[PDB]
């Protein structure tokens, strides 16, 4: 990645949970993730 | 086979509000450990949420739809944000 793109991702990695905005994708609970599939859309 | 679509204005707003690019949100599907849950049927497609690791640096949550066409699938990216503590816990240990 460019240095600037990498920097954006490292800044995001350091964001605290307090700084997350749930207005478009609300917070979940473990129970809502009971029927999840891992690797569902993985294409090699 | 899979292709990706989104509204360009929604992508710009998502970057402004949440700090996540849709071009990076697409990369959750390249993480073999991505974790996906189906929410509802909406406007002729299934809405899903997927957690995955982007560029080895950050776990993101992606809201998207899936539609099946003749010989290919289309994922529409709708929203994306950093995963929180519970969501990271499901991504690592679910």
Of the partner residues B30, B49, B55, the one whose CB lies closest to the CB of residue A9: B55
* C-alpha to C-alpha distance for B62 and B77, rounded to whole angstroms: 7
Q: How many residues does chain B have?
A: 94
Sign of torsion over alpha carbons B29, B48, B59, B90: negative
Full domain range(s) for residue B74? 2-93
Instruction: Specify the number of domains making up chain B.
Output: 1
Half-sphere exposure of B59 (CA within 13 A, CB side): 18
Helical residues (DSSP H) of chain B, grouped into ranges: 8-18, 22-25, 85-93
Resolution in A: 1.4
Give the helix/strand (H/E) hosting B68: strand B58-69
Inter-chain contact B49–A17, Cβ cutoff 8 Å? no
Q: List the CATH number of the domain containing B40.
A: 3.10.450.530
Eight-state DSSP code of residue B73? E
Of the partner residues A24, A40, A42, the one whose CB lies closest to the CB of residue B81: A24
């Amino acid at each position: 990645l460019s240095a600037q793109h990498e920097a954006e991702l490292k800044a995001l990695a350091k964001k605290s949970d307090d700084e997350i905005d749930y207005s478009d994708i609300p917070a979940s609970e473990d129970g809502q993730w009971s029927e999840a599939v891992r690797g569902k859309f993985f294409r090699p | 086979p899979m292709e990706f679509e989104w509204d360009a204005n929604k992508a710009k707003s998502n970057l402004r509000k949440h700090g996540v690019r849709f071009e990076d949100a697409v990369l959750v599907f390249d993480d073999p450990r991505h974790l996906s849950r189906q929410e509802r049927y909406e406007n002729g497609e299934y809405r899903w949420q997927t957690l995955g690791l982007v560029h080895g640096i950050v776990v993101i949550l992606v809201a998207h739809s899936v539609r099946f066409e003749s010989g290919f699938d289309v994922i529409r990216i709708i929203s994306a944000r950093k995963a929180d503590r519970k969501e990271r816990n499901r991504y690592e240990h679910g």
